[model samples]
Target: GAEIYNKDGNKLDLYGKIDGLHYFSDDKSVDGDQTYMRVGVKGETQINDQLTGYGQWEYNVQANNTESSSDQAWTRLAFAGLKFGDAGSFDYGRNYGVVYDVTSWTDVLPEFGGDGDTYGSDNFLQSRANGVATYRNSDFFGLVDGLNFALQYQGKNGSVSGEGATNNGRGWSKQNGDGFGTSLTYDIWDGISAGFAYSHSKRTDEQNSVPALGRGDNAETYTGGLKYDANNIYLASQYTQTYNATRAGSLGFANKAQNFEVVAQYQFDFGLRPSVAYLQSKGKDLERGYGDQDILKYVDVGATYYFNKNMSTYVDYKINLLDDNSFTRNAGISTDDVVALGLVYQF
Candidate 1:
């Protein structure tokens, strides 16, 4: 990547990647999954020796398939703000929440690791969200060697809204709700890091919706992770617990759930990398629904080869081990074995 400068010492840059994958699974037909085809433009202007102003716009190449006249290049993130050297950074716009920083540990597994079971809807304040204002500090008041912190707040007024709801935001806008989160990370020593995060959010029912189908309670998540990378070997693990203060009874919702994951990877001098990961989740007993105590298991093994700097390919396989009465079975699928091949080119 290269940057161009204007007469005012403002720098502009363009960067992106194109990626795709073909996957075959015993639970479904073979298909091509668009991993990512996206681009981003960013610029920064120096205001002083210690202060700078910056902005960025990023979009996806194709957002929806099977729609002939849908909008292409959907916006993923757009934001602008300021940066203070060694002090921290502050920004407003669509951006990742504070809790997401801790999940970055295991979410870096290329793919197949970021999905899991949740008690409520998938609209939790875990990943990136809209109407967000964020503040990040790389070093907390020079407290220690690699200490950092982040905080985020999201606010939405009015009633709940969604894709087809009458009160929907109309155009991929955020739902009505409020959320707050904070996280901390520290590098203990070379090749070792640890982090912790917590978040809380509340959602209100729209139009007096049914309790079973609509959310009307608070949602919270607690997360922690540790990682070590040295000598061409990488190792990491993360634990997450979620509490949804609503639904009760079997087939209702997960009152409480926990997820655990571990990953290992090794890189060879010959441009070959091998990796393996395991994840497990457990929660309140489904009783009459999915069996006694609910449980889910996932395992992934893969290898990657780098032919050159700008291109790479990989082959991987994953297995889902589910109980007979698992919720997956209710979704018209059960345990599955998936094989995939992926390609990526960056510039």
Candidate 2:
């Protein structure tokens, strides 16, 4: 990280990281060099003693793509907002959903773990998303310590053109009707905290009919999490369930989903941090007669040796517990084990 400019009530900071990474796996889609670089800028300006404005933008580039293809780069974050001192703040544009406040506690793995639960980008109220208007308050509007809350609204994205039409193959996984969400968190004591979040949205007509009628007309999610971070030890756990919100396949929808993630980590003074985690997701009611199906199930073990604050090297192994069953293969999900090695430099 670097400071580009700082003066008066205005400041700008630049942050970026480059990861030299590779994966060993039988899954062709995930095996090979996965190196990437991310660049971002954060800026803020004081409007007065009680108000402030800020904005941030971040972009990613796939370093392994040496073909000079424009598609190799994309934006990760781009948003602007205003803060009311002692009150709260509001922002809009692409950003993470409130549900992440809980899931993020268990997403500290070096690699190949966060995807559990299908917390996909652009899926309503999951991870990174688009057109979200957020209102946040810290310390419960200064009335309490270690208490925070956020309310968010998302504008509809894409269309419901036909009863069972696919949106150019993007499908329900990448689209949603107007939605609203909320999150609450509290620090209990001694580095222990808890979080809860929920979201509800209207489902697109196509999403309701895709694969069959009887699909829900609304998409909804509920999640809760707990964590303890102190004394060089980190532990976190999360559980989430969704209704007609998570996808079973690119063109398929599930009636419900249940997911969980747990992780533990310990940091040593010598710059070594070892981590362990387990994650799983079960999609239910895909077909009228089908039972629960495993979407993702794996254990992650890894360690990072930080050479310094700006440089580090790590290795991660994914112990996949999934099988190439009929449902899995038909859904195009991977069941192969994988290992990732990475060297990172940041500034």
Task: Indicate which candidate wins on TM-score.
Answer: 2
- The residue-by-residue lDDT of candidate 1 on 1-347, one tens digit each, is 54655657698888777877777776553345646587888889999999999998888786325567566667767889899987889998767767768776776465466634222222445765666788889878566668999888877533334533333352211333577889999998878999999888765454124323223366678999999989998999888887652133223334566778888999899898888988776665433444334455778888888877878888877777765553554433346777878888876
TM-score of each: 0.83, 0.94
Clashing pairs in 2: 1-347
Question: What C-alpha lDDT, on a 0 to 100 scale, does residue 111 get in candidate 1?
Answer: 49
CA lDDT for candidate 2: 0.85
Cα displacement (Å) at residue 161, model 2: 6.5
What does the lDDT read for residue 226 in candidate 2? Answer: 95
Which runs of model 2 end up more than 4 angstroms from their true locations? 68-70, 115-117, 160-170, 210-214
- Residue 280 of model 2, lDDT score: 87
Q: Per-model C-alpha lDDT, please?
A: 0.67, 0.85
The whole-model C-alpha lDDT of candidate 1 against the native structure comes to: 0.67
